[PDB]
């Protein structure tokens, strides 16, 4: 599909521990539907490289669904981005 408007995301459920060593989150999108979600994460101070290990394959906002995202992050101080919506994520070491 087309790329979801980076300015039209809000947190329905902010990033949180899943209980099975992943990070889960849910967003509400307010642009055209359906669309394909740009999601990424950066190690603080290094915005060039996406450190997110996405488990959710091809995350997509559907007309009546979508917005759940599951990922894994390297230890340290990270920032998660869904479009331009952001949330800090400290990832505990192994």
């Amino acid at each position, epitope marked *: 599909y087309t790329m979801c408007d980076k300015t039209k995301f809000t947190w329905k459920r902010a990033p949180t521990d899943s209980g099975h060593d992943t990070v889960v989150m849910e967003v509400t999108f307010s*642009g*055209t539907k359906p669309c394909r979600i740009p999601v990424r994460a950066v190690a603080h101070g290094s915005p060039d490289v996406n450190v997110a290990m996405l488990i959710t394959p091809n995350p997509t906002i559907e007309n009546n669904g979508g917005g759940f995202i599951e990922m894994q992050l390297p230890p340290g101080d990270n920032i998660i981005y869904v479009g331009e*919506l952001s949330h800090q994520w400290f990832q505990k070491g192994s």
Partner: antibody
Amino acid sequence: QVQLQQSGPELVKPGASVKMSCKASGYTFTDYVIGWVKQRTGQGLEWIGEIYPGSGTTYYNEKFKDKATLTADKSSNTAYMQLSSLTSEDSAVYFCARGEDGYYIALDYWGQGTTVTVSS
Amino acid sequence: DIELTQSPASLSASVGETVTITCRASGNIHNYLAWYQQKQGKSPQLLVYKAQTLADGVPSRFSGSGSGTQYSLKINSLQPEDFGSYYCQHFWSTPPWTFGGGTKLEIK
């Protein structure tokens, strides 16, 4: 050049419904949002809602969800707003305006407005 | 919802002078603030988007600034066509895309 041509003024009874149109020309219709804005005489602007003509996706201001219905016709490059159960609080100028689908951060051209007057 | 509070409500100035009006957001809108001008009995005209970018055709005496929740529109060297009402609007994250209450700029 980009033009949004709106339909003519309506003078109607309380309880009637009106359907107004916004015909787009000068661009590709389905690449742009059409939003709708209300303005009472001497007062400010209020966002009613918007439609993405390419996908049919709509968004409504909670205050207008039982009042406005937004539709679009790709073949005629036209957006429509229907207002139901009109009261004197609905008397206002209604604008349509254009935003960019996929990076919607402004209403960048505006129609000339359609005046709806509810009267006895 | 995000509320936009515009200030001053009205002001009177003379051609050639400088004026500044502001729009305060109740929450972070990430600079996604648009400014419009509307003259008496006319349609609003886009002046500024993303808080500092002038729209096509807008002369350089207009300038937008601001961030977080406080934004400013500055008009240098006022011209007769600059008079009217000015509105701000935000497009961050989730509707409603609310407008500020408007500022009325009129001749002295």
